[PDB]
Fold:
Amino acid sequence: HHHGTENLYFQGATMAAQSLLSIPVEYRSQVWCRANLPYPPAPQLPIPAVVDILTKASQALPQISFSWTLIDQPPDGSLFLVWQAPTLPSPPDGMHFMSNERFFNMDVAGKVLEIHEAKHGFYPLSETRTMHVRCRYRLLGVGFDNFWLVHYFQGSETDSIPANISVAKPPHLRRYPLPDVKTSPFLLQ
Ligand SMILES: [Cl-]
Structure:
């Protein structure tokens, strides 16, 4: 009646469900399911690098843990491996955008790579011009459909445009300060 779509994804994911239930209800919509790696930071990745990173993560999955955690204003270079349903909205990350996220599809070795590219990213508390890009990648048909590489990096000078939260997406500033909510680790395979 509120959770039918989420429930589909937690049929098999019991540990992940148990961990989310340990979080106060008001923060359950706010957390990412993020791998405990962490990835070394990187500039914008070549497409074959993206495909290799997701492929290696799919092969290593039984030895990689995840925590529910808040992501906020990550520095340029930040790369995360996340578990997320493609039919649910991305949780907040403190970034706002002056343009709509664009969805591209590439064929790589007979597989679909999704590229969700959000240019014109800004941090409204500290930026009056856009300075960032967020990309969300996933690789389909390799048994890793609901896992994503999320990458934050510096925008080009030419793409920088005036920023104003009043017309940005998402439309609401998140509430600060953030609570400490990071769960103990769990497995997803
Ligand atoms: Cl637009």
Notes: Residues 99-100 surround chloride ion (CB under 6 Å). Helices lie at 4-9, 14-21, 25-28, 47-60. Residues 39-64+73-167 form one domain.
